[PDB]
Amino acid sequence: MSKGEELFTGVVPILVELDGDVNGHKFSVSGEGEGDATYGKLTLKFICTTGKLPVPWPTLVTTFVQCFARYPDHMKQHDFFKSAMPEGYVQERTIFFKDDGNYKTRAEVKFEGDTLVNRIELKGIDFKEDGNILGHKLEYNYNSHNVYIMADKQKNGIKVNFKIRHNIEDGSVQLADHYQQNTPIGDGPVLLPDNHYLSTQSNLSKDPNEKRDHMVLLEFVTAAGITGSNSILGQVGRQLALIGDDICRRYDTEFQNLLEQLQPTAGNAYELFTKIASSLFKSGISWGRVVALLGFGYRLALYVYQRG
Amino acid sequence: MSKGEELFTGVVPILVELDGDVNGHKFSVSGEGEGDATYGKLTLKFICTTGKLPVPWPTLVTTFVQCFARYPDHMKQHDFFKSAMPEGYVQERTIFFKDDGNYKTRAEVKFEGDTLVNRIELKGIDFKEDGNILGHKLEYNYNSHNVYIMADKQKNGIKVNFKIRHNIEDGSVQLADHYQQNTPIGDGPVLLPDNHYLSTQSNLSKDPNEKRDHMVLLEFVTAAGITGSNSILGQVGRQLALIGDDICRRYDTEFQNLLEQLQPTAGNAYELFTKIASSLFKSGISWGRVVALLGFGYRLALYVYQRG
Amino acid sequence: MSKGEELFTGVVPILVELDGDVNGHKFSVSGEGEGDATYGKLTLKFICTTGKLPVPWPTLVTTFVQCFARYPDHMKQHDFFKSAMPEGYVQERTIFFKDDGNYKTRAEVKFEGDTLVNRIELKGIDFKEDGNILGHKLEYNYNSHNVYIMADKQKNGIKVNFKIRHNIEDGSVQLADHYQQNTPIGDGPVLLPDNHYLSTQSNLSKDPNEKRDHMVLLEFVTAAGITGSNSILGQVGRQLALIGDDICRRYDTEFQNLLEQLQPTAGNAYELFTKIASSLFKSGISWGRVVALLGFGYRLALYVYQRG
Amino acid sequence: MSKGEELFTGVVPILVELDGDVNGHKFSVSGEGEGDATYGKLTLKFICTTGKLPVPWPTLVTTFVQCFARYPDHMKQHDFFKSAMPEGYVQERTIFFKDDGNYKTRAEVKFEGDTLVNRIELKGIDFKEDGNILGHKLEYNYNSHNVYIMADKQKNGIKVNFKIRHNIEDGSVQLADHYQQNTPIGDGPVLLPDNHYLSTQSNLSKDPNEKRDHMVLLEFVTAAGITGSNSILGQVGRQLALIGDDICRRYDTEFQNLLEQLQPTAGNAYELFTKIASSLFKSGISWGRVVALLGFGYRLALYVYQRG
Questions:
Q1: Do C305 and A301 lie within an 8 Å CB cutoff?
Q2: Interface test with D, best of A1, A2, A9, A265 (most D CBs within 10 A)
Q3: Which residue of A169, D18, D66, D200 has the lowest C-beta tally within 10 Å?
Q4: How many domains does chain B have?
Q5: Which chains would you list as touching B if contact means 3+ CB atom pairs under 8 Å?
Q6: Residue B214's domain spans which residues?
Q7: Residues D189 and D237 in one domain
């Protein structure tokens, strides 16, 4: 359970910015939205500030914050992203479009204010004029994918792998082989995970109003590929839990038999209890007794408080 | 109902022996019979193995096994006698006759395998010849009496008060002021009482056949002094102690199972603690969990303080 | 708050017995009933076992257990009667009928079993043949009266005074000047009161069925004549009480503002609380904080437990 | 909002003095200006009272009053700076330049009646002449930065981490790795924080008129790092601490009033206690009583342990 975990508890705002060059066409882009790591939901609008954009959008969807993925509790000691926070992390990539060129990305994903920021620097090269890319042949959508995460301790960081599928107007498909590295800027302790992955599912819409080359992006991102946890710590929660999910229902209706048979009111309550007390303990002591006793008091209090 | 109680369901036999000294005349007496605590009944013959008994019989009736009282059903937890068994108890008293002397008695009421026994050491001092005692002036009866008991938790024992009236040939009466104390010798979970009392009624006969100086003796003896309030509560007070060792048993054996997993240090104890905690509750709450939880901080505080 | 107090908590059964002689006419009487000191109520039937009774009944109503009077809490350290218990007390009287003879009474009012007993011995003398008494001139009823109690330490007991009014068939009235003494049989500690009194009110009925000279008696008996108590101990209960009868209503609707604004459920409860905890205490500590905290938890628990 | 906080509602003046040694060249510098924490604003001129300043100005910008940050409204309880005032605090740090030397600094930020002051003692050691520092190679800017704070409760102080980037004429960059610690000197109820951070943005100008080696310096500085969860709880966490000293005050002065009535002994303490208790509750119960009650067992445990 990381400290940096604790930022993303609610919604968190987000700004993103990028300076691109691909085969010399330069450009820049800026975007805004919110993300809720708790529901593993993320919402964003992007606009190109050099006006028209030389590449089709989805190419960048990746490039454009895995801090916002939902890790459930058994897995929460594997959330690297949030641990590196607030000081953040550097995310470098190399994205190989198959049969075409490539992207190099470097980015700092860090907190500035109560805001989170992705500052990205991009260089594409060797693409082809009629390539899928420069021919704006890619459809406007995104498939789901899996992002495979494995710890790299030589770097006090992680390595990440996957491949991206951009459907084509044809019915053909284009592959983007994603190779990635995330290295904390902070010198603090981070969380290094066991191998696991993330399940991104995605949708690309547009803003009816907005007139500029833009993209509106939604991502759901959920963490998985582990079941036991640090197994017997969080598995303490199997038996301490049904110890109680049975203990409650064991005795609580002869408990109520005693309250329907002692009909206590606030006047007598104290005396009632205290008498049961010293007298019950004159028997002997263990905790085995000591518990039961106040089990009665919570259940007692409830009978008085409700009755009145 | 301590085991050592569940012994008296039916009849049980008895022997008694005593060695007196009173104003220098010594003697001994021994006797035999049975008693049934189920009905609070007792039966004995006493024959003086020194032949002539220098003191009137009724004086000794007291000295001469209170385990044999009927403890009624609601009171079963105030029987100190049926608890010290089978290991038994040492009963000693001091007896002040009005305008006359005293007896100090020491004795052990202990159990032997089947038969229950009283060996008694009595020390008389300072009586008057035309006095009631040495004159065999008190008549051959016994009255009813009440016997008042209070826990002395300081001794893991008990303390007792009563005072007895020996009618006299005079038509007068004589007092014997009795102060008594019991110190259970078996070291066990003896039962220590709330304040209460017992009521003797009694009779002295003789056997036509037997020619030795003797006495044949019967007692009905019953416990009381708990009326409705104290009953209906203090019954809740044991009925809770019952579920209190149902619990005590069933669980603290999956406990060591995990303490033997960590290896507490008193150092890391403070954290390891707050941690197994929050994860377990993330489930949900009622007390059924809450009890279970610190039954462990107790079986843990005992495993760090004992190992080390 | 006496130990012997604790017998009378519920209803307690009662037997009464008497051996009379007045001007030589001898008689005896026996009776049964219950009494509840808690409501200060007492109920009894009496029958004459020598058949017809030489005196009119009400003469005895007094003679025939002040243990059964209700002392309220401020006065409860003045209940002498119940303190002397279980060993009980001896009640002697002398009752002077004015212009007529007198009664002497001695009685032992003590516990035998779970039963309370009044054993009474009576001697009347010097009455007149046509006196109100032997002429059975007294009406059948009882007025209310006051019984004035003053402590007598020379006797580790009390002295008691009052005067009794037996209306007459005439419209005339007959006076019975009551002088009384109550001395514990027990050697224990008793409660010695400040001067105070008891307020008896009484009714004399008959049993339609029962054919023997009898009387059926009801007495309500309540204690009074004191207001402060041991004043500043039980007066602690003025300010510790409105400290709370205001404290409750001070903050409990912004408390509820926080629960209607935290909408807690059993899942999150623990986490919720614990966070408020260390963070609230990082401020500083006193108890002044420490209280408030769990004031929230009782009020929290109630919001979860009820909701669900 | 500690008093020592309620000081900064408006503008406040400032003086600064420093005495450096770096690779044996020493110097001193002193400066003047104002700052307003209400808007998180700060303004200063620095003039080198040794004339020529041997190190580039930006190096010192850091060393050169964090009380002047805007702590936003929800965060008011994490301001360690505005708490140590007026008595002030000692801030010392150590600064590691990459591939170059260090500065150790000691200083006291203390308040004098109206003006706030920094006297600084700086110790430089081991730098390189063609190095960035001694070569006045770093350009005349400053970047934005984030500053990360954690409570060190062990010092009743705090500990701090950040790292700063001085752009260089090269186009390169140089790091200055800052580690800092504050030990409040006034011994008081200082406020110790949850983990959080602050964000500087800054500018370096010069004055045309002034001919001494100088620097004119402005900082916007704001606190953040608490998002919704931790806010909405930890606001409950102070808002409870508020009612927690409403309470703390109002009452523990009728307390001594009664401890001064009894004369506890540690001996009779155990009973006197259980007793004032039951009588008070006989009234009725809710917690409003319960709190009040043991606020006393604490102000009592302190009156028996202190008197004796």
A1: no
A2: A9
A3: A169
A4: 2
A5: A, C
A6: 1-227
A7: no
